[PDB]
């Protein structure tokens, strides 16, 4: 299946506070009214330039992603997991099950870390930095993509250096958009939050 985003996948381009100021930016965004894949419950996808990723449930079936170029040994990859305990970021050379849902190798680790609902994420990878924005909104549905505006706040920053060309998902309904270089007009509140936006390449208006 395929579905239509309406106004989704807006993130704060960076720090620096700000108030009522229709500020104009050029960056990698998810264009308005886009063609987002639909998945039910999964396969190896591409990355190619960032990723939007929403998901819906009350239980927790979506238990992180896995990234990289080959998703195996002979080259390095990232692994982001969450058991019923808490998040586990990790960067080794792995041996991944072709249908993984545990691994089979954890060699040469170069980075470790340990510790209904709508959960959006924006993943991007620039200059050896793997940035992750996120937002958790409560739906009043169970598992369908709603409509509305909600800007995504930066979460993490990892100075890895890793190359990425592919990614997957991990399970115990989700969508995948892609990001392109667009120009947007963001409306800032007086507290400094983005309340509305304009995609400046959707038509003459």
């Amino acid at each position: 299946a395929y579905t239509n985003s309406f106004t989704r996948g807006v993130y704060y381009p960076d720090k620096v506070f700000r108030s009522s100021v229709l500020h104009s930016t050029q960056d990698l965004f998810l264009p308005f009214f886009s063609n987002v894949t639909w998945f039910h419950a999964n396969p190896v996808l591409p990355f190619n330039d960032g990723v939007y990723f929403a998901s819906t449930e009350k239980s927790n079936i979506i238990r992180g992603w896995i990234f990289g170029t080959t998703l195996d040994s002979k080259t390095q990859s990232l692994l982001i997991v969450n058991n019923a305990t808490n998040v586990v970021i990790k960067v080794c050379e792995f041996q991944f099950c072709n249908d993984p849902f545990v691994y089979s190798s954890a060699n040469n680790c170069t980075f470790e870390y340990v510790s209904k609902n709508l959960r959006e994420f924006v993943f991007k990878n620039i200059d050896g930095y793997f940035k992750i924005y996120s937002k958790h909104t409560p739906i009043n549905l169970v598992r369908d993509l709603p409509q509305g505006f909600s800007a995504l706040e930066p979460l993490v920053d990892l100075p890895i250096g890793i190359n990425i060309t592919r990614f997957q998902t991990l399970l115990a309904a989700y969508y995948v958009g892609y990001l392109q270089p667009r120009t947007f007009l963001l409306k800032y509140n007086e507290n400094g939050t983005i309340t509305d936006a304009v995609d400046c390449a959707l038509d003459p208006l």
Binding site: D127, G128, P159, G161
Partner: protein
């Protein structure tokens, strides 16, 4: 063990406190040439990356 020149290494520095005056006056380096900045003003700048 350093890496070869055709596939060179690239280490990225993170949040730290760097002291370049102990590098500029080590008297063991055969060549210390800075290009985008004078060397004596190295200790006072905050390089984003």
């Amino acid at each position: 063990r350093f890496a070869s020149v055709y596939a060179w290494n690239r280490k990225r520095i993170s949040n730290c406190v760097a002291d370049y005056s102990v590098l500029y006056n080590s008297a063991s380096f055969s060549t210390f040439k800075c290009y985008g900045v004078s060397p004596t003003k190295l200790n006072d700048l905050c390089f984003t990356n």
